[PDB]
Design a protein around this nucleic acid. Structure first.
Ligand code: MG
Length: 79
DNA sequence: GGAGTGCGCACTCC
DNA sequence: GGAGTGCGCACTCC
């Protein structure tokens, strides 16, 4: 398990927040949300997002270079 | 003034 | 047909 589970949880909470705002849960929106909720800097959030995707605890969907991240508990439309 | 948020609506996709 | 996605702004906050 590469990501810190505490940070994975905060990122999953960020994904839920951004989804509820009806925006794509992108890297940038996730970083801003986790900065607001806990003061973690952009570099650390980006690292932990990538590690969580490698762990399988966060899902990554890519469309022509643009990424959307999903909670395994609420994966929405996935193929 | 600019960051942040809410959501109606056009578009996607099954 | 319609549920899901997120774009585009009206709106709110400091
Ligand atoms: Mg969970």
């Amino acid at each position: 398990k590469l990501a810190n589970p505490l940070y994975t949880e905060w990122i999953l909470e960020a994904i839920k927040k951004v989804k509820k705002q009806k925006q794509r849960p992108s890297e940038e929106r996730i970083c801003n949300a986790v900065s607001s909720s806990h003061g973690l800097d952009r570099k650390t959030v980006l690292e932990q997002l990538e590690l969580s995707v490698k762990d399988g605890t966060i899902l990554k969907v890519s469309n022509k270079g643009l990424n959307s991240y999903k909670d395994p508990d609420n994966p929405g439309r996935i193929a």
